[PDB]
DNA sequence: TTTTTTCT
DNA sequence: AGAAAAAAA
């Protein structure tokens, strides 16, 4: 139930989520690779743009993020929109809805240009303000899947370029889509948004850090590299969710 | 239609 | 408010 899941997630903690993010999560590995082949500001802008087109993919998320990172390493990027106009039509893992996705990037381009290194620092210290600002730039609801996901991925990119860690805010929920709906139905009859926010509050682990724990473990990523005590807690969570 | 969105 | 968006079933 909710109490048991919250207890195990609380034992894992932000510390354990941070371990998974930085050591196991393949999307973080892809971002780390790209961060070594392009300037810090362009890197963060590209990560947000990529997140906003990361819906209805033609591939797994891990394949898509690696395709993104390998494509942009060493490239000279000026317009984010023009870069994506060339990138998406040749991609393997993001072939659906390309004109629509390019239009999202053209629309967010101005906001992305405000992401100087200092503004990135400011937003990493106040990710709820970034959450609302991305939504306003697109003219959409901030609860939408790709807006929430862009904040999560911004948090990965910012921590790399700023070499410091700030936890995600408790108020930002897990992104909602057919995938978390299905996982929640495996576990409980409670509605997903209510369920996971309750889990986050009870455990003390913000929802976006819970998001980091869930998907690698559910996808079968190995936990063997976790130190023995954390490994035991991750094994216990696997018993609950998989 | 199924796999998130725009916009009329 | 929900049809259509592109690709894939």
Residue numbers in the entry: -2 to 239
Task: List sentences from the manuscript.
To shed light on the opposite base selectivity at the atomic level, we also solved the 3D structures of the trapped Pab-AGOG-dsDNA harbouring either a T (Pab-AGOG_dsDNA-T) or an A (Pab-AGOG_dsDNA-A) opposite AP site. Concerning the structure with an A opposite the damage, the mode of interaction is less straightforward and clearly independent from the R93 interactions. Pab-AGOG appears to have no difficulty accommodating the steric hindrance of adenine in an intrahelical anti-conformation, but significant differences from the two structures described above for both protein and DNA conformation at the lesion site are observed. Indeed, the opposite A forms a Watson–Crick base pair with T3 of the lesion-containing strand leading to the repositioning of the Q53 and R93 sidechains. This binding-induced structural readjustment results in the loss of the interaction network linking the opposite base to the damaged strand that was observed in the structures with C or T opposite the damage. R93 is no longer able to establish contacts with the base opposite the lesion, nor with Q53, and its sidechain reorients to interact with A7* and A8* of the opposite strand, leaving space for the adenine opposite the lesion. In this structure, one should note that T1 and T2 base pair with A8* and A7* instead of A9* and A8*, respectively, as was the case for structures with C or A opposite the damage. This structural remodelling of the lesion recognition complex could be associated with the significant loss of affinity of Pab-AGOG for the AP site opposite A observed above. Overall, these structural models with C, T or A opposite the damage do not offer a simple explanation why the GO-DNA glycosylase activity of Pab-AGOG is less sensitive to the nature of the base opposite the damage. They do, however, indicate a high plasticity of the Pab-AGOG DNA binding site, which can accommodate a purine opposite the damage in an intrahelical conformation.
8-Oxoguanine (GO) is a major purine oxidation product in DNA. The major way to remove GO is the base excision repair pathway, usually initiated by a GO-DNA glycosylase. While no enzymes with an A/G specific-DNA glycosylase or a dGOTPase activity have been discovered in these species, a GO-DNA glycosylase called AGOG (for Archaeal GO-DNA Glycosylase) has been initially identified in the hyperthermophilic archaeon Pyrobaculum aerophilum. Despite very low sequence identity, AGOG is structurally similar to eukaryotic and prokaryotic OGG1 and OGG2 GO-DNA glycosylases and, like these two proteins, belongs to the Endo III structural superfamily partly defined by the central helix-hairpin-helix (HhH) element followed by a glycine/proline-rich region and an aspartate (GPD).
